[PDB]
Amino acid sequence: LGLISGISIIVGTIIGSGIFVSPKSVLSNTEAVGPCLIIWAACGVLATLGALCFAELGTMITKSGGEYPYLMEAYGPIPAYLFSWASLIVIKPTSFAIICLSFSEYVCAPFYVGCKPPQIVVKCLAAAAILFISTVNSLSVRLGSYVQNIFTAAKLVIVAIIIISGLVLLAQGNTKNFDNSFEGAQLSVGAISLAFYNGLWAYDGWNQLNYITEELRNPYRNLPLAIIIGIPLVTACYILMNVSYFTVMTATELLQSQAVAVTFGDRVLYPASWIVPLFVAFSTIGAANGTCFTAGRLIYVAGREGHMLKVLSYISVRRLTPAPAIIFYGIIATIYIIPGDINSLVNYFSFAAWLFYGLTILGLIVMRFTRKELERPIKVPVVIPVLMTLISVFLVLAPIISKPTWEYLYCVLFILSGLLFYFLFVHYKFGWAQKISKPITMHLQMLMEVVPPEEDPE
Amino acid sequence: FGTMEDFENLVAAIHDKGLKLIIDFIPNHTSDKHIWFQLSRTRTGKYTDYYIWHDCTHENGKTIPPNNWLSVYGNSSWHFDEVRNQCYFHQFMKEQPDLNFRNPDVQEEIKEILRFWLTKGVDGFSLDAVKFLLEAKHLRDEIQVNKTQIPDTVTQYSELYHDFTTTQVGMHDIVRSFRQTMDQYSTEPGRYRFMGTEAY
Numbered sequence: 048l049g050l051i052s053g054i055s056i057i058v059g060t061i062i063g064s065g066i067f068v069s070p071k072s073v074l075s076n077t078e079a080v081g082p083c084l085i086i087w088a089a090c091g092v093l094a095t096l097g098a099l100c101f102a103e104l105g106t107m108i109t110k111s112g113g114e115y116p117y118l119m120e121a122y123g124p125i126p127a128y129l130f131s132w133a134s135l136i137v138i139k140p141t142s143f144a145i146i147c148l149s150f151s152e153y154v155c156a157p158f159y160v161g162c163k164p165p166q167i168v169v170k171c172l173a174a175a176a177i178l179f180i181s182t183v184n185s186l187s188v189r190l191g192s193y194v195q196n197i198f199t200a201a202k203l204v205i206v207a208i209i210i211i212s213g214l215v216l217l218a219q220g221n222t223k224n225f226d227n228s229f230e231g232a233q234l235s236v237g238a239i240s241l242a243f244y245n246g247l248w249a250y251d252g253w254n255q256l257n258y259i260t261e262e263l264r265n266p267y268r269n270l271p272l273a274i275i276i277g278i279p280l281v282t283a284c285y286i287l288m289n290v291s292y293f294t295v296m297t298a299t300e301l302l303q304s305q306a307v308a309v310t311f312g313d314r315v316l317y318p319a320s321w322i323v324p325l326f327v328a329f330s331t332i333g334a335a336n337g338t339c340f341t342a343g344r345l346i347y348v349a350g351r352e353g354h355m356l357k358v359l360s361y362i363s364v365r366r367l368t369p370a371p372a373i374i375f376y377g378i379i380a381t382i383y384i385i386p387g388d389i390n391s392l393v394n395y396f397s398f399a400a401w402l403f404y405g406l407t408i409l410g411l412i413v414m415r416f417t418r419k420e421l422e423r424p425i426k427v428p429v430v431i432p433v434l435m436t437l438i439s440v441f442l443v444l445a446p447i448i449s450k451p452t453w454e455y456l457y458c459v460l461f462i463l464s465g466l467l468f469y470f471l472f473v474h475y476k477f478g479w480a481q482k483i484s485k486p487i488t489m490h491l492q493m494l495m496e497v498v499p500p501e502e503d504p505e
Numbered sequence: 506f507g508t509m510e511d512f513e514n515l516v517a518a519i520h521d522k523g524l525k526l527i528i529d530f531i532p533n534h535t536s537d538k539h540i541w542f543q544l545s546r547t548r549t550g551k552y553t554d555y556y557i558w559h560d561c562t563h564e565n566g567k568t569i570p571p572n573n574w575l576s577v578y579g580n581s582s583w584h585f586d587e588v589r590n591q592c593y594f595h596q597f598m599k600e601q602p603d604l605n606f607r608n609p610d611v612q613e614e615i616k617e618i619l620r621f622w623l624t625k626g627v628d629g630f631s632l633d634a635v636k637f638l639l640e641a642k643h644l645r646d647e648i649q650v651n652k653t654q655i656p657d658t659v660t661q662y663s664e665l666y667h668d669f670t671t672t673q674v675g676m677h678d679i680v681r682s683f684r685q686t687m688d689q690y691s692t693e694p695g696r697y698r699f700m701g702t703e704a705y
């Protein structure tokens with residue numbers, strides 16, 4: 048991989064299902080077109096400054112996991128344990144639930160042309176996509192990656208159709224909706240901070256660019272150069288897709304819409320309007336098939352320290368798959384869609400994710416005073432992790448001060464539920480702990496035929 | 506009522522509150538100051554058959570009409586034009602000459618007016634006086650309600666049976682072709698175009 052194929056993996060990773068669901072909720076909180084395009088550009092700066100700080104932490108430590116070896120080196124075991132606990136029950140199953148809910152919005156929308164589908168149909172189709180992907184990835188480990196490259200080709204084509212056909216309409220003079228773009232707006236701290244939750248969901252994947260883009264021809268120079276080129280170029284493709292939405296829709300017509308890109312393909316591509324519900328539905332289960340490849344990597348490295356159960360990250364003897372972890376993620380993601388509702392799972396996801404993005408980037412500054420003499424090949428200027436940890440407390444405190452809903456209580460109580468399990472199973476190892484953990488591991492071993500992975504740390 | 510910019514600001518403001526807008530449409534007749542009628546009575550081009558013209562015997566201040574047909578507001582429905590030296594038909598008033606809907610150039614001009622307002626963003630139309638669209642081309646006299654009445658005193662509209670001037674064969678097909686013109690602007694979901702007719 049050179050430099051050009053280094054920035055191509057960055058563009059393919061960061062373009063996901065977010066740009067097809069998020070424009071409604073950014074406009075719902077900043078009610079004008081003008082502020083709606085500033086938040087889409089300011090989210091691409093938070094993704095670029097955030098990925099640069101993770102690029103320094105990735106070369107300084109050089110250990111597998113996620114943010115788990117980064118938090119242990121800075122604070123110790125207690126924030127490292129809470130990240131392994133919150134990524135098990137909060138972060139990873141909600142990400143699997145938002146994607147499978149976004150798949151069922153785009154299948155059910157062309158059948159209910161001028162009205163909404165009922166909530167029983169979008170939820171019973173989303174649960175059928177969770178249980179289909181959780182069994183396909185639990186049987187046929189290599190089948191998920193043969194279809195993975197035609198699911199990325201279907202994603203970039205339908206993005207390039209919307210961008211190009213929007214610049215053609217912009218040249219003909221369909222620019223009336225941009226005329227008064229700053230009249231009627233919100234400088235409330237809860238309207239802007241939730242508009243940042245939905246824009247930054249469309250950039251999901253900037254914190255895992257380290258592990259796959261460090262097998263390059265010349266690292267420590269081409270990795271921070273692929274981030275400065277790659278993530279601002281997807282920021283240009285996200286602004287140009289919102290510009291294309293506002294050539295055929297008013298800001299009121301976009302709020303009164305079920306899926307935003309079906310409404311685009313119904314006013315532009317008229318005799319072939321079904322290609323937009325077809326290509327987005329392919330690209331969305333490909334984004335859910337891709338998150339089941341990663342099942343078991345953090346669970347293995349957290350269980351090696353005693354911070355996670357060891358019956359998870361076991362491997363099936365036939366069909367060599369991480370079957371106890373894939374089944375565990377499919378069960379919690381199915382529970383999450385019964386209360387359901389994208390715009391209520393994105394707030395639940397972004398509150399726990401940005402609490403631990405903020406603790407990790409703060410650990411970059413703590414390790415500049417505590418963990419010197421540690422050979423940093425990449426070294427960002429100090430003003431970049433300071434701004435990224437000041438926005439990270441603005442994105443945590445401002446929804447729970449100004450617009451408090453019930454998900455910010457159910458997310459805090461699920462993270463502090465793990466702090467009880469630290470002090471009974473890790474810090475104060477008692478007697479009754481391992482005689483619950485060992486018969487459960489023994490009986491789930493004969494049920495699923497799963498063994499320890501004949502392996503080493505790597 | 507304002508300008509065209511005042512209308513375009515009203516359509517945008519109506520849509521921003523979730524409302525819809527339907528307007529009236531008058532297909533049956535124009536004014537005598539319309540540019541089609543000023544070219545019709547000089548026999549200019551294709552406009553010669555845009556209105557219904559027939560010969561008559563107007564001399565010393567009185568016209569002899571081609572039949573006994575009456576206007577709705579009540580006198581003869583034929584009025585003599587001095588430039589054309591013929592008589593034209595009108596269902597309502599002498600300042601409202603009727604369009605000739607047996608001419609396919611007239612029906613194409615009406616479809617361009619429908620496409621003009623649907624492009625501006627109007628959500629529908631109410632069609633007025635659709636039963637007065639076609640008349641019988643045999644031009645025979647109506648039947649009087651009172652058959653012993655002398656025909657020089659029959660001047661009120663309620664004194665004739667209007668079998669040849671309302672609801673003729675082919676009138677419902679003209680209304681159905683208007684519905685097909687608006688169907689090209691209704692293929693988008695949520696932007697169906699309404700059509701209502703007023704026949705009282």
Ligand SMILES: CCCCCCCCCCCCCCCCCC(=O)OC[C@H](COP(=O)(O)O)OC(=O)CCCCCCCCCCCCCCCCC
Nearest residue numbers: 181182183185186363365366370374378382487494495496
């Ligand atoms: C209401 C809120 C709570 C809801 C809880 C609902 C629980 C329902 C469990 C449903 C499990 C469904 C499993 C079947 C999915 C098959 C997916 C697949 O492809 O498998 C391939 C895999 C391949 O096998 P092959 O066909 O032999 O190749 O097949 C299986 O592994 C089937 C084994 C079923 C696994 C069941 C796991 C259930 C674990 C429950 C443990 C509970 C312990 C609690 C103890 C607490 C003590 C304090």
Ligand SMILES: CCCCCCCCCCCCCCCCCC(=O)OC[C@H](COP(=O)(O)O)OC(=O)CCCCCCCCCCCCCCCCC
Nearest residue numbers: 136353354355356357358371374375382468472480483484
């Ligand atoms: C196939 C899917 C099922 C298989 C995987 C799940 C296992 C099923 C049983 C679940 C746990 C049963 C009780 C705990 C038993 C072990 C306790 C212990 O002493 O740990 C020692 C354990 C080490 O045991 P070792 O693996 O034997 O070394 O220490 C820890 O791992 C500390 C971390 C505890 C992690 C707890 C994980 C809880 C999973 C269930 C979460 C429930 C909430 C779901 C979401 C709410 C609704 C949305």
Ligand SMILES: *[C@@H]1O[C@H](CO)[C@@H](O[C@@H]2O[C@H](CO)[C@@H](O)[C@H](O)[C@H]2NC(C)=O)[C@H](O)[C@H]1NC(C)=O
Nearest residue numbers: 566567568576578579580581582657659660661
């Ligand atoms: C046509 O109808 C008009 C009514 O608008 C008649 O004109 C005059 O009507 C008033 C009543 O409002 C009478 O007092 C006048 O005597 C009418 N004028 C004349 C000259 O008689 C008119 O008579 C009707 N007929 C014609 C042929 O014009």
Ligand SMILES: *[C@@H]1O[C@H](CO)[C@@H](O[C@@H]2O[C@H](CO)[C@@H](O)[C@H](O)[C@H]2NC(C)=O)[C@H](O)[C@H]1NC(C)=O
Nearest residue numbers: 649650651652653654655656657658659660664
């Ligand atoms: C209208 O019809 C009537 C009968 O259908 C005609 O005859 C008149 O009828 C009334 C009824 O009582 C008599 O009082 C009159 O003597 C009749 N003769 C007349 C008015 O000459 C009548 O002629 C018809 N025409 C009009 C204009 O009324």
Ligand SMILES: [Ca+2]
Nearest residue numbers: 603637638639
């Ligand atoms: Ca007529």
